[PDB]
Structure formats: C-alpha cells, structure tokens
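@channel sequence for tomorrow's demo:
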Amino acid sequence: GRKLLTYQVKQGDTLNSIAADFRISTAALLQANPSLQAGLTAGQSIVIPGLPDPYTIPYHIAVSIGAKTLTLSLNNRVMKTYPIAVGKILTQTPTGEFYIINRQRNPGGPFGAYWLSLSKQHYGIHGTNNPASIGKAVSKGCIRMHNKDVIELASIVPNGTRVTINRGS
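structure tokens (generated this afternoon):
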C-alpha cells in the first residue's frame, strides 16, 4: 500500500467538489472511497489518490493572512518565509489547514512560472507576473507568490505538504 493524504468531510460536502478541490476524479475518489457514491458523512475520512501523506513530508507551510506571508519550514522549524497574496476567499477560514494537491510547472502565462494546486480550489499557491500584488490582500485572487519562490517550494516540498491558512492576527 501507499501512504496517502486523507480528507475529513464537512456536513454536506460534495464528491465532485472534492474532486474539483483536489483536481482529481470523482471516479478515483469513489475508487478510493466507495462510501461517497452512496452518500456523504461529516467527519468521514476520504482519501485522495495520487496524493501522498503530509506526515511523511519533512516540511510545513504556514500562510498568515494577517501578514500575507508563506512560511517554508523544515521539521516545523522555519527555513524561510516568502511573501504571498491572499484573496477574500481565504479570509473565510480562521484555521485554513490545507494541503498541496499537485503542481503545474511553467504554464507560460502570468501565472508565475508555476501553479501549485491546493486542497481547495480557490486556496491555491501560484506565482505571478505582477509581484507588487504579492504581500497584499486582493479581492479574490488565490495565494500568489513570486516566480523564484513558487519554484522553490515546487522543488523543495513535494505534494501533500500542508499549507496552513491562518488568519494569524
């Protein structure tokens, strides 16, 4: 067996939402969790195929809303911290504990040499071509970084790494 990343359902989650959120297939999420098709359960752990275990990962990321920052730690111990951007969509969760689902290396467009996808659709870490929006709070746009920084995380941390969206202070 493989060490994969789990999800704990909230009351009224959707199979196809989580397959949109983790950029997976509901057919694969049903493949990993035959219970989902039948119905959903709040607090039900459902796994994400293709996405490994965050607790095998040596790094941890802390996203501070109140600061607009991204902390790259190693074994909980901070290595670095990169500036990032937060849209009003992240402001919703005061705990925002999430996980990098997978990555998209240089798309080509302004998406900041990379698009590292998060466990929630709008919760996502990517680069930009307008760096002066970095460190800032934006209307909706998801957590933007700088190109060399979004490529850092992309080379340093693997998928499954936990990105903690904290309102902070």
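heads up for whoever presents: The first strand starts at residue 4 and ends at 8.
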